[PDB]
């Protein structure tokens, strides 16, 4: 027992006072080092968690909380924290708890003033309490904390409401929590999967209601650009589309949802957007399409979809910076008629760079004579490796002046593509029908 509970209480009072200057990382490292002693750790954490629950004269600490309101952080009459200061006491305590997770107090505190795995249940209950559930920052920190600690039914319901209701990093830490819980028990896996499905069905039902208003309003728009107000609640960053897709990506990450009323009305809605002669107007349904192709086309029906909306899914992909062969729409790589030429060209060049991403490319000289370029290049390269060809070639003509290498390369390629069709090399001959094309010269054995 290096330090007593009164000295620990004096240190912990520093978490309430919000001073920017104060070095709270050093204070966290002091508490961390003190918390190597198991009894100190246990009392410290039980106090910090009592501070969170109680957030949800020496002790005269005035925090400027709002306009014209300078609150006292402590109301002593059984010691309460004034709810204006609470979100800061929460923020500092969760900042300390994240480090202690990487690695009585009130009665002592009034005595002054007059002069991992078990409490995971409390930290999951904390999600219900209003100062936390309001604040996206405190929620993100508490979720990061839970995601570290994870390394019951209501407590998972409260963790899932964090996804069905409102933080991409905090909800990816919530995904980590829900995964690492499912690693724990088949029973928590099952209850959290089925309650994800329950929430995803609610999200799907209300998404079908929203798209039903959108489609109806597109009917009323045509029957007489697209800024349908029903679109606002789909454009929104916090739209049920993004919630539905997030939840489905977590379900599919746990696998290692019957909604034909949604999928067929997303269908007729997309068809009625495409018939309405606007293009980016589809993109307000891109995440619902990506959910459709997540739930279907499991690692057919998605192909009839991609057929009847082919040019639309191409507009989607062309607009999307999601890498065609790294995103969800990768499955259709092998059914290639469902992409645009320039989409396939982009896919080509990105997949080519992915396969060749390990090769460092250098610059590489090719020394040729203006009158012999073809044979000098053949001698230089024809025994070179593919990876030596993959180097950036720069061509030097003997004694010629320096010039722009890009124009000089374009000239070199032009001259080579010409010399290919000199009959002296016997590589290519014109089609006797067309007379402008070229095919292999069957007299190249000369």
């Amino acid at each position: 027992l290096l330090l007593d509970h009164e000295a620990l209480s004096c240190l912990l009072v520093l978490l309430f006072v919000d001073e920017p200057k104060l070095n709270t990382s050093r204070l966290h490292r002091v508490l961390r080092n003190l918390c190597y002693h198991a009894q100190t750790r246990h009392w410290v954490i039980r106090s910090l968690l009592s501070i969170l629950q109680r957030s949800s004269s020496w002790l005269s600490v005035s925090m400027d909380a709002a306009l014209g309101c300078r609150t006292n952080i402590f109301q002593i009459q059984t010691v309460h924290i004034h709810p204006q200061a609470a979100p800061v006491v929460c923020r500092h305590v969760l900042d300390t708890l994240i480090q202690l997770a990487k690695v009585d107090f009130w009665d002592l505190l009034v005595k002054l003033d007059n002069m991992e795995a078990s409490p995971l249940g409390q930290l999951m209950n904390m999600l219900s309490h209003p100062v936390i559930r309001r604040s996206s920052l405190l929620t993100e920190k508490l979720l990061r904390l839970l995601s570290l600690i994870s390394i019951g039914l209501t407590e998972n319901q409260l963790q899932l409401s964090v996804e069905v209701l409102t933080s991409e990093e905090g909800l990816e830490d919530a995904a980590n929590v829900l995964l690492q819980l499912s690693r724990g028990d088949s029973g928590t896996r099952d209850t959290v999967l089925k309650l994800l499905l329950n929430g995803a069905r609610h999200l799907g039902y209300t998404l079908c209601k929203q798209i039903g208003t959108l489609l109806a309003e597109l009917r009323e728009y045509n029957l007489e650009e697209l800024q349908l107000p029903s679109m606002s609640m789909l454009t929104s960053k916090t739209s049920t589309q993004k919630f539905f897709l997030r939840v489905l990506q977590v379900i599919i990450q746990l696998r290692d949802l019957s909604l034909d009323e949604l999928w067929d009305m997303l269908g007729e809605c997309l068809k009625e957007l495409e018939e309405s002669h606007d293009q980016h107007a589809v993109l307000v349904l891109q995440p619902a399409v990506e959910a459709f192709f997540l739930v279907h086309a499991t690692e057919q029906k998605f192909l009839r979809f991609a057929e009847t909306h082919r040019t639309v899914l191409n507009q989607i992909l062309r607009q999307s910076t999601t890498h065609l062969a790294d995103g969800p729409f990768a499955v259709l790589v092998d059914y290639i008629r469902v992409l645009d030429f320039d989409v396939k060209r982009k896919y080509f060049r990105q997949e080519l760079e992915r396969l060749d991403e390990g090769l460092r490319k250098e610059d590489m000289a090719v020394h040729v004579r203006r009158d012999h370029v073809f044979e000098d290049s053949y001698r230089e390269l024809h025994r070179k490796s593919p990876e030596e060809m993959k180097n950036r070639l720069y061509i030097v003509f003997e004694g010629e002046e320096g010039q722009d290498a890009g124009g000089l390369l374009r000239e070199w390629y032009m001259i080579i593509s010409r010399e290919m069709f000199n009959p002296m090399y016997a590589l290519f001959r014109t089609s006797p029908g067309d007379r402008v094309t070229y095919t292999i010269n069957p007299s190249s054995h000369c």
Binding site: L355, G433, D434, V436
Partner: protein, 127 residues
């Protein structure tokens, strides 16, 4: 990885998408059973103008056998027997079959499709 392109698209990848002077082609088109003011021909020009550069190139490949645009313009469009202009023929066969091409004559046989939309659909499905 190259097999994602079609046999058309590989030409468009190696030699690039051409710029089609539709005015030069139209000025160098021969109409055999259609006429220049036939409704299917006005539909043809509307369709081909509505087609993107790649579908125009695929049409040029469809009718000439290549995407190569003649440097001198389509007045210099070659066929098997010297300069042969692009040419549209009415295909008096059933209009439930695609147009058909005889590229050595730069010849299109084109059924009398009943509507702009249907003609456009059939041509786009051909290319």
């Amino acid at each position: 990885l190259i097999s994602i392109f079609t046999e058309q698209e590989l030409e468009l990848l190696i030699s690039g998408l051409p710029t089609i002077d539709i005015d030069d082609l139209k000025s160098n088109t021969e109409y055999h059973k259609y006429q220049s003011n036939s409704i299917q021909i006005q539909w043809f020009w509307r369709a081909l103008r509505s087609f993107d550069q790649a579908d125009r190139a695929k049409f040029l490949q469809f009718v000439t056998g290549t995407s190569k645009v003649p440097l001198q313009g389509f007045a210099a469009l070659e066929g098997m027997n010297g300069i042969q202009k692009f040419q549209i023929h009415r295909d008096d066969r059933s209009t439930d079959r695609l147009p058909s091409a005889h590229t050595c004559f730069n010849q299109l046989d084109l059924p009398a499709y009943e509507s702009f939309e249907k003609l456009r659909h059939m041509l786009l499905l051909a290319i």
